């Protein structure tokens, strides 16, 4: 099947939205009750295993469009709302364990809530990709979801983080390096699915080689990106994408092999197929102690190897026209170091589904805003834990 590593969801303290002499009137008093219930509806969903994306889309639309009122204003799209700094939100981090981080900024709350939804999308894709019963149609979802997620992350990174007041701390999800890794990881994960499909429908070996190669480049990039963080938290993750780029490079050499043999070129059809199986060996060496290496998130046990069932045929077929050449069973001359691969893939590459927040709620009118009188402003609960599975 499919196997993806999942860092834990972000947790946050209850926000009541209760201001007293500050809220005068029915409409303003209403909107604080809508922000209250809607944020909570969105939060119970995360923990909830019964939720499909169309439910999620809605719950998030609701909140974020109500949340907007605290950030920008309905009159000038360029000028900022008086409420942005009113409330203080406390969120935890995927890699930081139980330690909360707090800011009184509505941008912080938005960027972090949204982050949790993008994280959610992937988790939904991940849970949905574990089953053996995968349907052509259900794959379109796992795949689409990963792009919806890569899109959200992208948006947050380059459209939003810039707006934050305080700079973000190293090793916090709201750091643009850490986001950049998620976007990429998401894109990569999707393509895994595509590969899984391309293989199943018998597409051309050149294709699956290039697609699988470019995918290994992704975990390359997300290893380099992440590389700037203290190894304590990023340890397990870095090993898994280090592991993944390695498992998918095997596919590259392997499926590239069939592009040489069929091309009537032997020595490098072998040295490659060897390289593929040398790597699939190291890949499992990496799985084993990624399982040993401690870090946030559950350990996913890698499932599908048809890799052999593929290599098997190639091996058989290769020795057939090469029997008179390098081998059998004693190979010369077979090139010392492995054949370089620079391949671009023209099919199956993933572009993040462009994301945007919903415009500010129509419930925000100048009267509804002026009904929050900041002139009248004059102890904390704690973050309610995630408890995933």
């Amino acid at each position: 099947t499919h196997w993806f590593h999942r860092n834990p969801l972000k947790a946050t303290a209850p926000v009541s939205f209760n201001y007293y002499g500050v809220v005068t009137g029915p409409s303003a008093s209403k909107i604080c009750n809508d922000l209250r219930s809607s944020r909570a509806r969105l939060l119970e969903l995360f923990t909830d295993l019964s939720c499909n994306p169309e439910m999620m889309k809605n719950a998030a639309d609701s909140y974020f469009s109500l949340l907007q009122g605290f950030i920008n204003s309905l009159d000038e799209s360029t000028q900022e709302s008086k409420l942005r700094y009113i409330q203080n939100f406390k969120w935890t981090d995927t890699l930081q364990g139980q330690v909360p981080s707090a800011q009184q900024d509505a941008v912080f709350e938005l960027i972090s809530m949204g982050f949790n939804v993008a994280l959610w999308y992937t988790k939904y894709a991940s849970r949905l990709a574990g089953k053996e019963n995968i349907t052509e149609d259900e794959a379109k979802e796992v795949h689409r979801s990963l792009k919806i997620a890569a899109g959200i992350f992208k948006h947050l990174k380059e459209s939003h983080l810039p707006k934050l007041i305080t700079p973000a701390e190293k090793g916090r999800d709201l750091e643009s390096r850490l986001i950049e890794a998620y976007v990429i990881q998401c894109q990569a994960e999707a393509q895994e699915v595509t590969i899984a499909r391309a293989i199943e429908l018998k597409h051309a070996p050149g294709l699956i080689a290039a697609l699988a190669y470019e995918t290994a480049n992704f975990y390359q990039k997300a290893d380099h990106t992440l590389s700037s963080l203290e190894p304590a938290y990023s340890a397990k993750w870095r090993k898994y994408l280090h592991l993944k780029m390695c498992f998918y490079t095997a596919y590259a050499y392997c499926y590239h092999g069939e592009t040489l043999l069929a091309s009537d070129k032997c020595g490098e059809a072998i040295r490659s197929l060897q390289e593929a199986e040398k790597l699939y060996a190291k890949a499992e060496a990496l799985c084993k102690e990624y399982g040993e290496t401690k870090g946030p998130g559950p350990t996913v046990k890698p499932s599908g190897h048809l890799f052999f069932r593929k290599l098997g045929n190639l091996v058989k077929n290769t020795l057939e026209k090469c029997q008179r050449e390098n081998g059998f069973i004693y190979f010369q001359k077979i090139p010392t170091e492995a054949p370089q691969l620079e391949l671009k893939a023209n099919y199956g590459l993933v572009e993040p589904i462009p994301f945007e927040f919903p415009p500010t709620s129509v419930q925000w009118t100048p009267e509804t805003l002026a009904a929050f009188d900041l002139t009248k402003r004059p102890t904390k609960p704690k973050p309610e834990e995630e408890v995933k599975p």
């Binding site: 794959a139 379109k140 391309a198 429908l201 023209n346």
Partner: peptide
Amino acid sequence: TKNKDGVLVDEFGLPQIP
């Protein structure tokens, strides 16, 4: 649908054939 180069394409971005 089709892609930029004009090729009939799987919903998955892949080429389309029997």
